[PDB]
Design a binder for these strands. Structure first.
Ligand SMILES: Nc1nc2c(ncn2[C@@H]2O[C@H](COP(=O)(O)OP(=O)(O)OP(=O)(O)OP(=O)(O)OC[C@H]3O[C@@H](n4cnc5c(N)ncnc54)[C@H](O)[C@@H]3O)[C@@H](O)[C@H]2O)c(=O)[nH]1
Ligand SMILES: Nc1ccn([C@@H]2O[C@H](COP(=O)(O)CP(=O)(O)OP(=O)(O)O)[C@@H](O)[C@H]2O)c(=O)n1
Ligand SMILES: [Mg+2]
Ligand SMILES: [Mg+2]
Ligand SMILES: [Mg+2]
Ligand SMILES: [Mg+2]
Ligand SMILES: [Zn+2]
Ligand SMILES: [Zn+2]
Lengths: 260, 146, 96, 1370
DNA sequence: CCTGCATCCGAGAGCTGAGAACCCAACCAT
DNA sequence: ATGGTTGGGTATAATGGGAGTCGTCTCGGATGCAGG
């Protein structure tokens, strides 16, 4: 049990990296990327297709839209390159291995970033998985030439993915991202106004502090739209025998008196 | 523990303010509480009323503070006793916990007196909750009132 | 509840008492025509308002809810006739 | 429309789920945040689940009917009724298979049993902690080849999959002792402070410097971390070539001339266990390919791989390194479990288990049978085991998981919506992440959470922390939580419902009502009978139409006078049902004719309060209105109060005088006694008359005249008829309690005018003088027992109508005479006897002695305590006797004494507490105090005594509060074990019977004494004689129902030694299927006549057993100077007693062998001699050299029922259980017939266990119903094979109820998950035999008017019958 | 190899009434 | 043609979490451990 401890154990089973190993891995993935684009332009095939087939071969048959016959036939079709071209394949494969190794090594940075986003409508493991997606994206778009540390560029992508996940999955009734950030800014302004005034602000103060284009009706509408629904199974009374839905009548089906 | 106040009459509110509950957050559960915690203990004398409790599943779990009882700063209920020395009942009143009460022989409040001297050869008393009959010299404390 | 203009609960032990009396028809009325047989209660009210006798009851809606909730647990609950052929208690509203 | 007869439950295949669904929900969106309309492809989409509006699509193209079945092209919504939103399912396609938790966590696991996997192993595999291997491909682990179904941990799998390798760092400034590309043995130090630990080739990682020769002189080039080395170690270079490629083109290291290149000062070493292969041209296999020995590796096939492994082509050194590995196929999770389940062949596995079942081992055979049960359930049902793993998850219709707008404008939702959202989110993220080729760790994590989300959706709070909504700690309500529990669907909405046409109100006494009438408030009747009232007012001229009548009735001030007359017309002849909770027995609901009254309180008849257990200190009752002609006929004929006068449990009157009625009748029927005369002598009556007239003798003094005992009243007042005596009473000449002489019925009776008046009351009530004279006992005061006997005899002799009339007359006259009697209670009425003082003082004497006997040394502490307690209890008994003797001698008309004697109110203990003394009290630990409460309630207690008694008062309150729940639980268990038993036929034809004994053995003196007459009545009354009986020159024929008079005759004959036991039919020996027959059941105890076919006797038996336990068993306990309900529950559950006694398994003689340290008993038969070693402190009921039979006890205590079953057999266990259950109820004073316990015990003994399957397909040790195996054996005899051999079993009520054939009743009882999963695997088909299943289905129960025996009856008049024949005569 | 014997886990425990980053740019819907 | 909604980007460095729960009692089955 306790899946967080299991995930932490699995993540700690992979050792960390030094600067030299990190730059080596990044250089290898960079050369693998350059190799796959070179191969794609040489053969005239879609770079995404060849990258997917190459990575499928690197993973193995364990990873079952492309029939096995298809990927195998393409793999034999890339075995028709005389020389100075199979080097592209080998560099690409080593780059894919470098990508995997780097992601596995730096998943702990995802954990470290995500551990301070708990308590906002998403469980810790969901935050970790969205951070992992962001880390994969950052590994995809990292340029090691700048001599910057891996975490410096990875942190922005991880935080962006986490914030997007909070905005998109925290509420049962979906609210778009712009409205979500508007609501957060409204709440922050309200709390600063409460701190300064020494009491709960009125809608006029919040509208004034928002800026141009904000009036009391607009803040009232925003606050009305920002309410989250309650459960039909909320316990009513001290004893464990009454639910909320016990007080909700049906207004859709006609009554016996109405039907007659 | 935060309850809609009962104010049918002033006595209702006064009763509600003096209620003691064994339930609540970090307390007992109504359906699985055994006889041991719902029984009138011998130390309830003068601290918790042995009579006023709700009938039903809450019997013994909700009780009432006794009339003269006072909760001390540490949270222990104390009850008052008159000091008696040499068979003479004095006006000094000492508020004591159950542990302190366990150390003495305490006479009943209805002990007959002439002036303030115990005018009875046989005195009904409590020793660690056990009813006993003692001589006036052995008496250490007396009840303030029934 | 009285505040909701609600009705009295006919619980398990009341059903036991009705069964012990052998009052099959009264119990069937309580289970269907008065609680959750929608078409049944509608027809009963219309029949009483027109002076006829109340009609025969049907399957209560709570059983349909039970069947639907058992299907949500990936369990195939099916009602059968005397020849073990399926009988559709949903009148065809749930068949593709 | 064909009727439903069976309900089947079975497993659902993924194809079945996909066939159910109308579409896949693709997004977790529920509704739009701004327009409040369902989102496309969401959990509420109208395209999938149906339209919200009736016959109108989402986009508004179609807004009319006639468009049924067509789907709008713009919106995709079919135009149909909106109600289909509560029927139509959806589905979710999982990215990876997930296991249904019901088949994983319900012990024993069905999947684990099928695959022979333990619970921990399945936990490890399913939740991604260990691998399970398929097709090992000849891999070697630790020198041992790997076999299928083997568990590999993450490190063990990784080592086998990829090979062993480690990296050793090198501190700066320290070089290595080896070269690049050389093999390293374990322990070979690579540095002055670094030592290797594995074998294999070692390679340098990041050499710091590069030495380049020139064709000679060397040169050194520094390698910075940001640039890499290309040239292989020890390889020549050419002019212009690059050596150390760099990020900057100008910063690259270019070879100036031709020279060798070497790499030195490594940063780390990588030692791997691998093979190495140099090449000098293009290679064939690229990095990431797996090869076998003897495959093409490089150089066009010159070099070949020699071991299994993975290839990496190091282009820097231009060498192929093949790391020794395998292509092992090990998987983890539900995907691997499903692969295993698909491959399973059930026939071969069944053959293997059948072969295993021949082992001499008992445990191995038991486990083989356990596996075979599941295997055969799957084989017979036709279900595939792989369906046990979910590929498509069904989605409940939206209307059962609503998102609704509350009156305040806020939304309310179900937890199921959030669970579905969580599942959909995790599935979508898994699909996205799979599309990116993410590493295995993240995929494992995602699949773990997906499995957990499926678990939470199906069964939340089973493993680990339950899922809760943010900001709360309340667990989310899953489907299983909805289905099961006291709050679940089955118990809260199917076995009980809220109903229409119902009300409730406070009740008040209705003393002027008749037995069949109840007082109903006017407004209550207006609301209850509203539709009938609307019809009546429309028929009249009160309103033009029904709507106008409703509008008139909706406003209180708009109601008129004629509508009340219309209401009186409506309810004429109709009845309503009154119910008081808790409904302990069936008489908790009764039918009454409503009399419209003013006010808001229901008026209840005084004589039905005892049946309802109702009083008038705030009780409330519910009112229901039966609607149809069938319901009204059932209520008026079967459930009317005046038709239910006898108890269904005992057959004794239950509607009978009580409280004030008894008091008044006793007051008028008691005779005055005076002491003024006190046995004076007179020779002639006239001298006695003159003595009274001069004032020396009282009127009622017992004098003797002329040798005859008489009184002055007998001689002075001789009345010719009762009218004259009552006229003299009206003139004050004599009192109702004075003894005079009256001529009645042609005889001269010395009696009182009150007793004559009572006789006249009965005679005029029953309209029969001779029968009334026969019924009554004239020469005794009328009290509770005599009045009850009168009611019973009147019932027997006259019928229900005349009995009810007599009951009403008795109630009226009892009330009238209790009003004017002058009964009151003052403080002086608690008379304290003088002897009490003496009794105390004498006690104060003995106490001193005891103290002396302890202060000198002739007594210990325990003995002193015991003697003090015994002295005080004897003193309390003496005080009680003195109190009641004083009452009887000096104040025979004292109010407390009269109340206690007449049975109106009070018992001797309470009277003693009022008058004499309270007595000893118990400490909270359960021990008595040493000093008693010597004051009564009249004298007033002291503070200390009050506090001492508070312990017992509180303990009694807690006793009530915490035992009523256990008794209610027992009643529910009995109902769920006996609900199917009905009277189904007139006679089963059996010739078996039971023998009810009339003499009980005694433990003391080992002698037979006649049983208590109440016990014989409880065991014999109403039964059918199995054999002819000849007693006292009287023939009781076979097939005779034993009346009460017959039982008394049998007792009288047994007292003369003419009979020892009575053979009767019983439910224990009935042969009817799913019930009993009329002859084996006997009387309907509530009607004193043979039971009608179709009576639900199982429910009646369960209620009869449960009702007394709820209140009167160890009601308010009075704190005054293995038992009870726990013993009864232990017996009904077949619990093994903790105080178990020892029985003799075989026949023989007794030889007790006792040494100073140990004790034993030997039973010596003629064949064998067995031994029983017993504690020395144990008790022995036998003596040395005595004879004991098999199963006869040798020790005191509770007997183990199962050991007794093994020893003596089934009938002995039946008799033991019935008698031991009856003991507890008899000790409490409860009258209850043996039949009900016999029914429950018959249900307890329903099953057998196979010892030898013979020529059947059954298995050894398989539990199955007795009827089924008997039928199987009979058919085997018909076919000519060997019978199945079986032994009876004994199961508690809980296990017997959960072992029934019908899965609906078992699921609605308890343990819903286990019952449902077993039934679904087996594909069980419910035949709807019992009552609970038909109640759940909302059908007509097969009992009473729903019985097939009576429900097809036709009725027709003479006119129609003939002409139907005239048509046939043609 | 069999057996018995503590040990652990799961499932019960009456009825009715009421009570917490920001910004910028492209893109479908209506 | 307009808002409302959605996708993409930020570059010193950062690298394994945190609340919690200890006052029920029995009973029945599944099970691992001890002995012979
Ligand atoms: N089947 C049944 N019958 C009962 C019960 N208890 C009493 N009777 C009958 O009622 C007559 C008068 O009994 P009472 O003289 O006791 O009066 P009451 O109405 O019970 O009121 P209270 O004195 O309790 O006043 P309250 O202010 O405390 O009421 C508010 C609080 O009481 C409790 N409470 C109030 N009402 C009920 C109720 N209906 N059911 C259960 N608990 C109730 C509850 O806990 C609530 O939260 C008795 O003779 C019996 O026929 C019972 O448990 N079950
Ligand atoms: N939880 C409960 C409490 C009560 N009841 C019902 O209320 C009645 C009176 O209990 P009560 O305590 O109100 C009085 P009673 O015992 O008759 O009085 P006395 O000895 O002081 O004269 C019981 O007999 C039950 O039918 C219930 O079903 N569930
Ligand atoms: Mg109460
Ligand atoms: Mg009452
Ligand atoms: Mg009473
Ligand atoms: Mg005369
Ligand atoms: Zn449309
Ligand atoms: Zn029979």
């Amino acid at each position: 049990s306790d899946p967080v401890r299991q995930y932490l154990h699995e993540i700690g089973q992979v050792p960390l990296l030094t600067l030299e190993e990190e730059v080596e891995l990044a250089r290898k993935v960079e050369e693998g990327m350059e190799a796959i684009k070179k191969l794609s332009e040489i053969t005239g095939l879609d770079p995404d297709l060849i990258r997917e087939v190459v990575r499928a071969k690197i993973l193995g048959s364990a990873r079952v839209t492309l029939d096995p016959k298809t990927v195998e036939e393409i793999d034999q079709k890339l075995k028709s390159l005389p020389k100075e071209h199979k080097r592209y394949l080998h560099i690409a494969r080593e780059g894919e291995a470098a990508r995997q190794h780097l992601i596995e090594a730096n998943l702990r940075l995802v954990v470290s970033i995500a551990k301070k986003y708990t308590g906002r409508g998403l469980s810790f493991l969901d935050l970790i998985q969205e951070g992992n997606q962001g880390l994969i994206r950052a590994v995809e778009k990292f340029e090691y030439k700048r001599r910057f540390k891996f975490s410096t560029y990875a942190t922005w992508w991880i935080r962006q993915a986490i914030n997007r996940a909070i905005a998109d999955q925290a509420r049962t009734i979906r609210i778009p991202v712009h409205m979500v950030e508007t609501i957060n800014k409204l709440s922050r302004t309200a709390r600063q106004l409460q701190q300064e005034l020494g009491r709960e602000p009125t809608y006029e103060e919040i509208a004034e502090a928002m800026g141009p284009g904000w009036d009391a009706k607009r803040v009232e509408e925003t606050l009305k739209i920002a309410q989250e629904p309650v459960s039909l199974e909320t316990p009513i009374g001290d004893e464990k025998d009454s639910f909320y839905g016990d007080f909700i009548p049906d207004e859709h089906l006609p009554s016996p008196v109405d039907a007659a | 523990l935060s309850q809609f106040k009962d104010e049918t009459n002033p006595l209702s509110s006064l009763r509600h303010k003096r209620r003691i509950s064994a339930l609540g957050p970090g307390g007992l559960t109504r359906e699985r509480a055994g006889f041991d915690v719902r029984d009138v203990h011998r130390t309830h004398y003068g601290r918790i009323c042995p009579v006023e409790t709700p009938e039903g599943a809450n019997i013994g779990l909700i009780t009432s503070l006794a009339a003269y009882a006072r909760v001390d700063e540490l949270g222990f209920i104390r009850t008052p006793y008159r000091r008696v020395v040499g068979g003479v009942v004095t006006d000094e009143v000492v508020y004591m916990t159950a542990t302190e009460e366990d150390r003495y022989t305490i006479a009943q409040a209805n002990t007959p007196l002439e002036g303030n001297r115990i005018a009875a050869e046989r005195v009904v008393a409590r020793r660690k909750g056990e009813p006993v009959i003692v001589s006036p010299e052995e008496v250490e404390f007396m009840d303030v009132s029934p | 509840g009285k505040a909701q203009f609600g009705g009295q609960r006919f619980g398990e032990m009341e059903v036991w008492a009705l069964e012990a009396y052998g009052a099959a028809h009264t119990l069937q009325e309580m289970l269907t025509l008065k609680s959750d047989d929608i078409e049944g209660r509608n027809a009963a009210y219309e029949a009483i308002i027109k002076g006829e006798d109340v009609p025969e009851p049907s399957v209560p809606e709570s059983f349909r809810v039970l069947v639907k909730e058992l299907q949500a647990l990936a369990l195939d609950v099916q009602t059968l006739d005397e020849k073990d052929n399926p009988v559709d208690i949903f009148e065809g509203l749930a068949s593709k | 429309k064909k009727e439903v007869r069976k309900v089947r439950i079975a497993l659902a295949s993924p194809e079945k789920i996909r066939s159910w669904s109308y579409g896949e929900v693709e997004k977790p969106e529920t509704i739009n945040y701004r327009t409040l309309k369902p989102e496309r492809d969401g959990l509420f989409d109208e395209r999938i689940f149906g339209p919200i509006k009736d016959y109108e699509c989402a986009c508004g193209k179609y807004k009319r009917q006639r468009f049924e079945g067509k789907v709008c092209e713009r919106c995709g919504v079919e135009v149909t009724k909106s109600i289909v939103r509560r029927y139509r399912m959806g589905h979710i396609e999982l990215a990876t298979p997930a296991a249904h938790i019901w088949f994983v966590k319900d012990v024993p696991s069905k999947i684990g049993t099928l695959l022979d996997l333990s619970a921990t192993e399945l936990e490890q595999v399913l939740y991604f902690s260990k691998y399970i291997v398929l097709d090992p491909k000849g891999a070697i682990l630790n020198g041992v080849p790997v076999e299928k179904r083997q568990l590999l941990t993450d490190e063990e799998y990784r080592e086998l999959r990829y090979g062993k390798q480690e990296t050793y760092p090198l501190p700066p400034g320290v070089d290595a002792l080896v070269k690049d590309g050389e093999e390293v043995v374990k322990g070979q130090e690579l540095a002055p402070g670094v030592v290797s630990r594995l074998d294999g080739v070692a390679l340098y990682r990041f050499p710091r410097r590069v030495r380049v020769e020139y064709v000679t002189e060397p040169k050194d080039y520094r390698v910075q971390p940001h640039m890499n080395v290309v040239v292989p170690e020890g390889a020549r270079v050419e002019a212009g070539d690059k050596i150390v490629a760099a990020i900057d083109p100008e910063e690259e290291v270019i070879a100036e001339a031709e020279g060798v290149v070497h790499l030195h000062e490594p940063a780390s070493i990588l030692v791997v266990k691998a093979r190495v292969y140099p090449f000098e041209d293009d290679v064939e296999v690229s990095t990431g390919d797996r090869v076998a020995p003897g495959d093409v590796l490089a150089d066009g096939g010159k070099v070949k791989s020699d071991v299994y492994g993975r290839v990496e082509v190091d282009l820097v050194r231009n060498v192929v390194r093949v790391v020794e590995s395998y292509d092992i196929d090990a998987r983890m999770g539900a995907e691997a479990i499903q692969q295993l389940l698909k491959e399973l062949d059930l026939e071969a596995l069944e053959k293997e288990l059948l072969e295993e079942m021949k082992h001499p081992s008992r445990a191995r055979r038991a486990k083989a049978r356990k596996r075979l049960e599941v295997v055969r359930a799957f084989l017979d049902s036709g279900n595939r085991p792989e369906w046990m793993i979910l590929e498509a998850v069904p989605v409940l219709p939206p209307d059962l998981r609503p998102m609704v707008q509350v009156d305040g404008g806020r939304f309310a939702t179900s937890d199921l919506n959030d669970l579905y959202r969580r599942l959909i989110n995790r599935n979508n993220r898994l699909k996205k992440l799979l599309a990116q080729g993410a590493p295995e760790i993240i995929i494992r994590n995602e699949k773990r959470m997906l499995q957990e989300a499926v678990d939470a959706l199906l069964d939340n709070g089973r493993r680990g922390a339950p899922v809760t909504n943010p900001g709360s700690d309340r667990p989310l309500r899953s489907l299983t939580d909805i289905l099961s529990g006291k709050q679940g669907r089955f118990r809260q909405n199917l076995l009980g419902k809220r109903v229409d046409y119902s009300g409730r109100s406070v009740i008040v006494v209705g003393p002027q009502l008749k037995l069949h009438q109840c007082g109903l408030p006017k407004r209550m009747a207006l609301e209850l009978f509203k539709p009938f009232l609307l019809k009546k007012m429309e028929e009249k001229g009160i309103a033009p139409n029904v709507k106008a009548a409703r509008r008139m009735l909706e406003r209180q001030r708009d109601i008129k006078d004629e509508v009340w007359d219309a209401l009186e017309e409506v309810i004429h002849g109709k009845v309503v049902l009154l119910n008081r909770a808790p409904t302990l027995h069936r008489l908790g609901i009764q039918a009454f004719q409503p009399v419209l009254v003013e006010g808001q309180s229901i008026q209840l008849h005084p004589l039905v309060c005892e049946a309802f257990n109702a009083d008038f200190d705030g009780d409330q009752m519910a009112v229901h209105v039966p609607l149809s002609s069938f319901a009204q006929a059932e209520a008026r004929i079967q459930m009317l109060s005046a038709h239910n006068l006898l108890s269904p449990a005992s057959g004794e009157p239950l509607a009978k005088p009580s409280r004030d009625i008894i008091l008044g009748l006793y007051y008028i029927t008691q005779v005055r006694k005076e002491k003024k005369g006190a046995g004076l002598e007179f020779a002639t009556p006239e001298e006695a008359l003159a003595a009274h007239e001069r004032g020396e003798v009282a009127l009622n003094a017992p004098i003797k005249v002329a040798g005859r005992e008489t009184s002055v009243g007998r001689l002075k007042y001789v009345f010719a008829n009762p009218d004259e005596a009552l006229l003299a009473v009206a003139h004050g000449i004599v009192d109702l309690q004075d003894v005079v002489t009256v001529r009645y019925m042609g005889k001269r009776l010395e009696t009182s005018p009150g007793r004559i008046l009572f006789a006249r009351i009965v005679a005029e009530a029953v309209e029969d003088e001779k029968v009334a004279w026969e019924l009554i006992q004239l020469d005794v005061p009328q009290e509770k027992n005599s009045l009850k006997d009168l009611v019973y005899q009147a019932f027997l002799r006259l019928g229900m109508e005349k009995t009810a009339r007599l009951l009403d007359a008795l109630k009226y006259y009892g009330f009238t005479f209790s009003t004017t009697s002058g009964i009151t209670i003052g403080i002086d009425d608690a008379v304290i006897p003088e002897e009490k003082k003496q009794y105390l003082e004498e006690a104060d004497r003995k106490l001193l002695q005891i103290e002396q006997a302890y202060e000198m040394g002739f007594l210990t502490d325990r003995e002193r305590y015991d003697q003090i307690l015994q002295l005080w209890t004897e003193t309390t008994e003496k005080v009680t006797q003195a109190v009641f003797k004083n009452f009887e001698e000096n104040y025979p008309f004292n109010p407390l004494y009269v109340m206690a004697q007449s049975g109106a109110r009070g018992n001797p203990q309470q009277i003693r507490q009022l008058c004499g003394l309270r007595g000893l009290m118990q400490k909270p630990s359960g021990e008595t105090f040493e000093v008693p409460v010597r004051s009564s309630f009249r004298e007033g207690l002291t503070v200390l005594e009050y506090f001492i008694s508070s312990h017992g008062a509180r303990k009694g309150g807690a006793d009530t509060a915490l035992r009523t729940a256990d008794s209610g639980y027992l009643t529910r268990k009995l109902v769920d074990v006996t609900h199917e038993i009905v009277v189904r036929e007139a006679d089963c034809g059996t010739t078996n019977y039971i023998s009810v004994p009339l003499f009980q053995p005694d433990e003391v003196t080992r002698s037979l004494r006649l049983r208590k007459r109440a016990d014989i009545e409880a065991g014999l009354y109403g039964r059918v004689l199995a054999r002819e009986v000849e007693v006292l020159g009287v023939r009781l024929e076979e097939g005779r129902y034993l009346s009460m008079d017959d039982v008394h005759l049998l007792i009288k004959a047994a007292e003369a030694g003419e009979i020892q036991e009575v053979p009767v039919r019983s439910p224990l020996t009935c042969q009817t299927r799913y019930g009993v027959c009329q002859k084996c059941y006997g009387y309907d105890l509530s009607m004193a006549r043979p039971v009608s076919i179709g009576e639900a006797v199982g429910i009646v038996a369960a209620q009869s057993i449960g009702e007394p336990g709820t209140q009167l068993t160890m009601r308010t306990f009075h704190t005054g100077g293995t038992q009870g309900l726990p013993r009864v529950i232990e017996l009904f559950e077949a619990r093994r007693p903790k105080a178990k006694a020892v029985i003799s398994e075989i026949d023989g003689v007794v030889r007790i062998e006792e040494t100073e340290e140990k004790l034993s008993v030997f039973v010596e038969s003629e064949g064998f001699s067995k031994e029983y070693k017993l504690p020395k402190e144990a008790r022995l009921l036998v003596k040395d050299g005595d004879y004991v039979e098999a199963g006869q006890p040798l020790t005191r205590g509770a007997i183990d029922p199962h050991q007794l079953l093994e020893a003596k057999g089934p009938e002995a266990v039946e008799r033991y259980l019935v008698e031991e259950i009856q003991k507890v109820y008899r000790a409490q004073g409860v009258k209850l017939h043996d039949k009900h316990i016999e029914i429950v015990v018959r249900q307890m003994m329903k099953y057998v266990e196979v010892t030898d399957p013979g020529d059947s397909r059954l298995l050894e040790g398989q539990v199955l119903e007795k009827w089924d195996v008997e039928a199987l054996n009979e058919r085997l005899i018909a076919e000519g094979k060997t019978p199945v051999a079986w032994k009876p079993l004994l199961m508690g009520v809980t296990k017997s109820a959960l072992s029934t054939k019908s899965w609906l009743s078992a699921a609605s009882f308890q343990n819903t998950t286990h019952v449902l999963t077993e039934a679904a695997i087996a594909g069980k088909k419910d035949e709807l035999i019992g009552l609970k299943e038909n109640v759940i289905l909302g059908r007509l129960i097969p009992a009473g008017t729903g019985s097939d025996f009576v429900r097809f009856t036709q009725v027709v008049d003479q006119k129609t019958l003939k002409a139907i024949e005239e048509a046939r005569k043609e």
